[PDB]
Write an enzyme that holds these catalytic residues in place. Sequence first.
Site, PDB file in Angstrom:
ATOM      1  N   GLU A   1       0.943  -1.105  -0.214  1.00 35.96           N
ATOM      2  CA  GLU A   1      -0.073   0.067  -0.114  1.00 35.96           C
ATOM      3  C   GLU A   1       0.966   1.426  -0.048  1.00 35.96           C
ATOM      4  OE1 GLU A   1      -1.758   1.708   3.490  1.00 35.96           O
ATOM      5  OE2 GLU A   1      -3.604   1.541   2.490  1.00 35.96           O
TER       6      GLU A   1
ATOM      7  N   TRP B   1      -8.397  -2.273   0.370  1.00 30.10           N
ATOM      8  CA  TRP B   1      -9.091  -1.236  -0.275  1.00 30.10           C
ATOM      9  C   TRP B   1     -10.334  -1.415  -1.219  1.00 30.10           C
ATOM     10  CZ3 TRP B   1      -8.772   3.700   0.843  1.00 30.10           C
ATOM     11  CH2 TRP B   1      -7.471   4.235   1.300  1.00 30.10           C
TER      12      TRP B   1
ATOM     13  N   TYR C   1      -5.230   9.772  -0.979  1.00 27.13           N
ATOM     14  CA  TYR C   1      -3.810   9.881  -0.467  1.00 27.13           C
ATOM     15  C   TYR C   1      -2.719   9.802  -1.722  1.00 27.13           C
ATOM     16  CZ  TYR C   1      -5.596   8.094   4.015  1.00 27.13           C
ATOM     17  OH  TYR C   1      -6.064   7.961   5.181  1.00 27.13           O
TER      18      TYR C   1
ATOM     19  N   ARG D   1      11.086  24.602   9.092  1.00 21.71           N
ATOM     20  CA  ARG D   1       9.739  24.271   9.924  1.00 21.71           C
ATOM     21  C   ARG D   1       8.851  24.205   9.108  1.00 21.71           C
ATOM     22  NH1 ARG D   1      11.502  29.872  12.594  1.00 21.71           N
ATOM     23  NH2 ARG D   1      13.045  29.219  14.586  1.00 21.71           N
TER      24      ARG D   1
ATOM     25  N   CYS E   1      -7.704   9.735   6.776  1.00 22.56           N
ATOM     26  CA  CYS E   1      -7.689   9.617   8.157  1.00 22.56           C
ATOM     27  C   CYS E   1      -6.435   9.852   8.657  1.00 22.56           C
ATOM     28  CB  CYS E   1      -7.853   8.146   8.616  1.00 22.56           C
ATOM     29  SG  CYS E   1      -9.216   7.129   7.969  1.00 22.56           S
TER      30      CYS E   1
ATOM     31  N   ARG F   1      -6.718  12.168  12.294  1.00 18.96           N
ATOM     32  CA  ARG F   1      -8.149  12.706  12.651  1.00 18.96           C
ATOM     33  C   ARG F   1      -8.792  11.849  13.199  1.00 18.96           C
ATOM     34  NH1 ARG F   1     -11.220  10.870   7.557  1.00 18.96           N
ATOM     35  NH2 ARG F   1     -12.955  10.793   9.396  1.00 18.96           N
TER      36      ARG F   1
ATOM     37  N   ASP G   1      -9.116   3.922  14.876  1.00 19.72           N
ATOM     38  CA  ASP G   1      -9.444   2.781  15.234  1.00 19.72           C
ATOM     39  C   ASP G   1      -8.313   1.861  15.987  1.00 19.72           C
ATOM     40  OD1 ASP G   1     -10.345  -0.023  15.924  1.00 19.72           O
ATOM     41  OD2 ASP G   1     -11.232  -0.393  13.984  1.00 19.72           O
TER      42      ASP G   1
ATOM     43  N   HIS H   1     -10.378   5.998  19.019  1.00 21.25           N
ATOM     44  CA  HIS H   1     -11.399   5.177  19.628  1.00 21.25           C
ATOM     45  C   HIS H   1     -11.158   3.440  19.605  1.00 21.25           C
ATOM     46  CE1 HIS H   1     -12.579   6.149  15.305  1.00 21.25           C
ATOM     47  NE2 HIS H   1     -12.807   4.804  15.471  1.00 21.25           N
ATOM     48  N   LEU H   2     -12.201   2.818  20.433  1.00 24.10           N
ATOM     49  CA  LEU H   2     -12.170   1.409  20.431  1.00 24.10           C
ATOM     50  C   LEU H   2     -13.848   0.993  20.105  1.00 24.10           C
ATOM     51  CD1 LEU H   2     -10.678   0.128  23.397  1.00 24.10           C
ATOM     52  CD2 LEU H   2      -9.818  -0.260  21.246  1.00 24.10           C
ATOM     53  N   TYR H   3     -13.965   0.211  19.035  1.00 23.92           N
ATOM     54  CA  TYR H   3     -15.410  -0.218  18.877  1.00 23.92           C
ATOM     55  C   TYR H   3     -15.838  -1.284  19.967  1.00 23.92           C
ATOM     56  CZ  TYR H   3     -15.443   1.897  14.353  1.00 23.92           C
ATOM     57  OH  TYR H   3     -15.674   2.932  13.557  1.00 23.92           O
TER      58      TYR H   3
HETATM   59  C1  LIG Z   1       7.963  32.310  12.671  1.00 19.68           C
HETATM   60  C2  LIG Z   1       8.288  32.059  13.963  1.00 19.68           C
HETATM   61  O1  LIG Z   1       7.199  32.802  14.933  1.00 19.68           O
HETATM   62  C3  LIG Z   1       6.182  31.884  15.475  1.00 19.68           C
HETATM   63  N1  LIG Z   1       4.952  31.963  15.417  1.00 19.68           N
HETATM   64  C4  LIG Z   1       4.418  32.727  14.594  1.00 19.68           C
HETATM   65  C5  LIG Z   1       2.820  32.954  14.265  1.00 19.68           C
HETATM   66  C6  LIG Z   1       1.953  32.440  15.358  1.00 19.68           C
HETATM   67  O2  LIG Z   1       0.915  32.385  15.324  1.00 19.68           O
HETATM   68  N2  LIG Z   1       2.809  31.889  16.631  1.00 19.68           N
HETATM   69  C7  LIG Z   1       4.130  31.352  16.495  1.00 19.68           C
HETATM   70  O3  LIG Z   1       4.452  30.957  17.649  1.00 19.68           O
HETATM   71  C8  LIG Z   1       6.784  30.614  14.723  1.00 19.68           C
HETATM   72  C9  LIG Z   1       8.227  30.589  14.552  1.00 19.68           C
HETATM   73  O4  LIG Z   1       8.801  30.710  15.914  1.00 19.68           O
HETATM   74  C1  LIG Z   2     -13.196   4.944   9.717  1.00 23.67           C
HETATM   75  C2  LIG Z   2     -12.633   3.976  10.903  1.00 23.67           C
HETATM   76  O1  LIG Z   2     -11.284   3.093  10.618  1.00 23.67           O
HETATM   77  C3  LIG Z   2     -10.192   3.816  11.219  1.00 23.67           C
HETATM   78  N1  LIG Z   2      -9.142   3.813  10.239  1.00 23.67           N
HETATM   79  C4  LIG Z   2      -9.138   4.154   9.015  1.00 23.67           C
HETATM   80  C5  LIG Z   2      -8.068   4.105   8.077  1.00 23.67           C
HETATM   81  C6  LIG Z   2      -6.758   4.203   8.877  1.00 23.67           C
HETATM   82  O2  LIG Z   2      -5.714   4.296   8.162  1.00 23.67           O
HETATM   83  N2  LIG Z   2      -6.746   3.923  10.353  1.00 23.67           N
HETATM   84  C7  LIG Z   2      -7.708   4.041  11.218  1.00 23.67           C
HETATM   85  O3  LIG Z   2      -7.747   3.649  12.398  1.00 23.67           O
HETATM   86  C8  LIG Z   2     -10.861   5.368  11.457  1.00 23.67           C
HETATM   87  C9  LIG Z   2     -12.342   5.168  11.990  1.00 23.67           C
HETATM   88  O4  LIG Z   2     -11.955   4.510  13.121  1.00 23.67           O
END
Ligand SMILES: C[C@H]1O[C@@H](n2ccc(=O)[nH]c2=O)C[C@@H]1O
Ligand SMILES: C[C@H]1O[C@@H](n2ccc(=O)[nH]c2=O)C[C@@H]1O
Lengths: 264, 264
Positions: free
Chosen positions: A58, A80, A94, A126, A146, A166, A169, A207-209
């Site tokens: 993958e 998939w 992706y 950065r 995800c 975001r 599981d 989470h855990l189902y």
């Molecule tokens: C660009 C420099 O300022 C910092 N910086 C900038 C914008 C903001 O919202 N917060 C923050 O900490 C990031 C890096 O340390």
């Molecule tokens: C959609 C459900 O499967 C989960 N899920 C899906 C794809 C992945 O890469 N990892 C993961 O944990 C997210 C949520 O719990």
Amino acid sequence: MKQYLELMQKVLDEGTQKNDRTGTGTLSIFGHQMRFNLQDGFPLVTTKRCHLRSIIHELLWFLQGDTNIAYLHENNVTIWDEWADENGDLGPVYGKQWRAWPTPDGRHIDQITTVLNQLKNDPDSRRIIVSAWNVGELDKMALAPCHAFFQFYVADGKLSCQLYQRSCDVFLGLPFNIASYALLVHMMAQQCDLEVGDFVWTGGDTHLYSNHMDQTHLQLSREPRPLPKLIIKRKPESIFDYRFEDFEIEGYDPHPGIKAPVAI
Amino acid sequence: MKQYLELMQKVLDEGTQKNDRTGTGTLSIFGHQMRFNLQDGFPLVTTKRCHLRSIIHELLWFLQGDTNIAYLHENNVTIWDEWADENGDLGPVYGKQWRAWPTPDGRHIDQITTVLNQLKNDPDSRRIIVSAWNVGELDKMALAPCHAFFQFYVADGKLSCQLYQRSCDVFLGLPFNIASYALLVHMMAQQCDLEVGDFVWTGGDTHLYSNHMDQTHLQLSREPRPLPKLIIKRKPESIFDYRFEDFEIEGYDPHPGIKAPVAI
Ligand SMILES: C[C@H]1O[C@@H](n2ccc(=O)[nH]c2=O)C[C@@H]1O
Ligand SMILES: C[C@H]1O[C@@H](n2ccc(=O)[nH]c2=O)C[C@@H]1O
């Protein structure tokens, strides 16, 4: 792994009862972060046997910018299938966002070559990020990303990487997401002549189902085993020239695999 | 705040010497996460006096989808002057991405109305995200987004939110970034008739500039003070109808302000 069994435990003790899309109940926490020093061994969960061959296939499929299931089918990787349409298309998920993010003015941005460029020519940046959360293409994707966003970091000859996930599981999906990304940090590092550092995992709704409770109690019974060692047998001429056979996991002795059923 | 002074301490003890863009040295760590329960009080740093009036005006400016400095100038908020061009334009930074993310096919997506729609009609969603990391517009922005990505979460009548910040100056920038976002969680919550939950802050390259060491040692001398209370005097008809005067901070008794110089 210690950090993963500690997270399983934290969802059981602290998770709120939250439901999934018109379905299954979950125990859920929001915001969690774990760190794996990749110098200590490869972060593959040993308290249940995990199969890495679909993970490798993958990942190499994502690096080709491939959004169709054909490649995975040629290798009988079927993870998939559930999302693909009649032609094997998953939409701009992706691989398409990593290798060809579409701009308003007709360009396609290769975020994976940008990131290598920055690690080689500007390692103190950065801004070394690749994002798969393309808001204007989310309606056409089979599922929204995800593992949506990740940032690289270089300090003292060592490459680290933070993934924002975001949704997670913890039983079925997370051991697979940690290995896939830890494998990408080792490939990136090899190509930039840097050592491996940390993989930092950050999650959102973790989470855990509810119908995986017997299995999570069974896994928490098990003592973790020494972490394996990933050996890459070859240094490809670029990040897009790796093959399934280039990777070997050494010293992996897991406990038996546990099955986790899903509602439909 | 306890969590912020604990992070200052962690950068001093654990940070590696890393340099900034052709400039100043920094002590830097990668990957950090803090949690602020917004029910315990408003997370404004009390070990140095912070001025919230530029924070409020910058937030209300972002919600209007405004990318020009004029509004801020009408209120003599001068925090973005350094980046603006001759006409006051900053390029497609934050406000434009939040309110009008441009798609390849000519649409402009309002991610702030999408997020309110989801909190009201689908609160258990694991996709309630707004992103300012638009890869195809980064070359035209005055600076790439530092607070790049954030996710909302609802459980038990309470709205939580996680911010991913790719880069963070712990002394000068972070007290300002925590208050700005905690203020957005209170406005979002008021509009969705939800209580406030947690603000989870996640950072990437989290640093202290070397020429702020006397000031960070001075602030770590100070004992934290009880956290203030944010009172919103009015419930606007929508998230885009708030005014500077609607907010009051109650019970804020900080230690004196500390100045932090910057190299040029
Ligand atoms: C660009 C420099 O300022 C910092 N910086 C900038 C914008 C903001 O919202 N917060 C923050 O900490 C990031 C890096 O340390
Ligand atoms: C959609 C459900 O499967 C989960 N899920 C899906 C794809 C992945 O890469 N990892 C993961 O944990 C997210 C949520 O719990």
